[PDB]
Design an enzyme around this catalytic site. Sequence first.
Site, PDB file in Angstrom:
ATOM      1  N   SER A   1       0.850  -1.200   0.000  1.00 21.17           N
ATOM      2  CA  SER A   1       0.000   0.000   0.000  1.00 21.17           C
ATOM      3  C   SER A   1       0.882   1.245   0.000  1.00 21.17           C
ATOM      4  O   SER A   1       1.618   1.457  -0.991  1.00 21.17           O
ATOM      5  CB  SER A   1      -0.983  -0.081   1.132  1.00 21.17           C
ATOM      6  OG  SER A   1      -1.997   0.874   0.923  1.00 21.17           O
TER       7      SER A   1
ATOM      8  N   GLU B   1     -10.631  -4.134  -4.773  1.00 14.29           N
ATOM      9  CA  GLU B   1      -9.898  -3.055  -4.089  1.00 14.29           C
ATOM     10  C   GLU B   1     -10.255  -1.720  -4.696  1.00 14.29           C
ATOM     11  O   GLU B   1     -10.207  -1.598  -5.946  1.00 14.29           O
ATOM     12  CB  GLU B   1      -8.397  -3.221  -4.261  1.00 14.29           C
ATOM     13  CG  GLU B   1      -7.856  -4.211  -3.301  1.00 14.29           C
ATOM     14  CD  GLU B   1      -6.366  -3.971  -3.125  1.00 14.29           C
ATOM     15  OE1 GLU B   1      -6.004  -2.911  -2.584  1.00 14.29           O
ATOM     16  OE2 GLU B   1      -5.610  -4.871  -3.445  1.00 14.29           O
TER      17      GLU B   1
ATOM     18  N   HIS C   1      -7.789  -5.450   0.034  1.00 12.55           N
ATOM     19  CA  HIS C   1      -6.535  -4.707   0.285  1.00 12.55           C
ATOM     20  C   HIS C   1      -5.576  -5.509   1.153  1.00 12.55           C
ATOM     21  O   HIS C   1      -5.926  -5.903   2.256  1.00 12.55           O
ATOM     22  CB  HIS C   1      -6.905  -3.381   0.921  1.00 12.55           C
ATOM     23  CG  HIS C   1      -5.774  -2.435   1.011  1.00 12.55           C
ATOM     24  ND1 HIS C   1      -5.085  -2.025  -0.117  1.00 12.55           N
ATOM     25  CD2 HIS C   1      -5.216  -1.831   2.085  1.00 12.55           C
ATOM     26  CE1 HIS C   1      -4.143  -1.170   0.261  1.00 12.55           C
ATOM     27  NE2 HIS C   1      -4.204  -1.032   1.611  1.00 12.55           N
TER      28      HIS C   1
END
Length: 294
Positions: free
Chosen positions: A143, A236, A266
Amino acid sequence: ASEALTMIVNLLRSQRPLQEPTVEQMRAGLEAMAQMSPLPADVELTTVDAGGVPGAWVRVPESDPDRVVLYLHGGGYVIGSIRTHRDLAQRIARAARCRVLLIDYRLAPEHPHPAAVEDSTRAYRWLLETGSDPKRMAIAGDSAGGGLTVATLVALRDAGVPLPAAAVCLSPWVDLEGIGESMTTKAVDPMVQREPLLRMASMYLAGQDPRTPLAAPLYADLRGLPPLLIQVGTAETLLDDSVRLAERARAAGVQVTLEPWEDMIHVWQAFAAMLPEGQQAIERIGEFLRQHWQ
Ligand SMILES: COc1ccc2cc([C@@H](C)C(=O)O)ccc2c1
Ligand SMILES: COc1ccc2cc([C@@H](C)C(=O)O)ccc2c1
Ligand SMILES: COc1ccc2cc([C@@H](C)C(=O)O)ccc2c1
Ligand SMILES: COc1ccc2cc([C@@H](C)C(=O)O)ccc2c1
């Protein structure tokens, strides 16, 4: 998808706060969630000063110490720690049969951009200084840390520093304005909502242009980066961050593998203790890394 996926999605949906959390509550909440994944008995963690950035080595008995992943944790550039991401790190060390250097890079809002990239590049230079070979190194992250992986590569290349053998991005965050199509169409994603993500972007940027390339590497020059694995879930809101990143990297001549995992959420790899697809994705990370270290 596994029955475990629906259980995780339902738990996350049920536990999402009804009032916007503070930075302190988000940090504490993630530390609480990560404490439910206990550290296997065979994992060795060694506290180290990575050339001015606090770090921990993570290894398992089958780790080849000559192979190193520099691991950049996620958390929107605002949350996360060695403790939140040590389970993901040990799973990667085990699958890739390497050691992982997990760093506690400086976080916003206390230390805005570019402190995170100063720390990641300093840690990488420290690995080269202490005798790690780029041909047996990789940079990986999830991320925010997936965005930071790309920024770190760009910053090292621009400095004339030798790049590692490969890089791995898990659900990378590279668009700090949230203008990907999926940041509307996928709103199936119980953990990444546009407003809170843009709150974290504001804290990281501290008034800097939201398209600043080392903060938002969708706008960076990606030419000469090493082979890249991007793993992303199709459920996502950040799906189109990975799609746009792959497009940009491939256009710049980078050897990109874009792996879209059907129905995954995620950083589903963080749930590998109970989510089969999370462990399967981490085995694929280990295979990619060992292939590029041959
Ligand atoms: C345990 O389950 C959750 C699920 C989503 C969450 C999202 C946030 C942030 C992004 C938010 O809602 O502002 C925080 C805690 C959360 C906890
Ligand atoms: C608005 O107040 C809250 C309430 C619960 C929270 C829980 C988390 C944890 C469990 C999380 O990150 O999932 C975080 C922030 C939170 C903020
Ligand atoms: C069960 O253990 C975890 C550990 C870390 C996690 C991190 C994230 C996000 C904030 C991230 O990619 O840093 C999500 C779920 C997670 C679950
Ligand atoms: C609030 O939502 C959750 C959902 C699944 C979780 C799974 C773990 C462990 C078992 C994991 O898979 O690592 C931890 C926290 C969790 C929190």
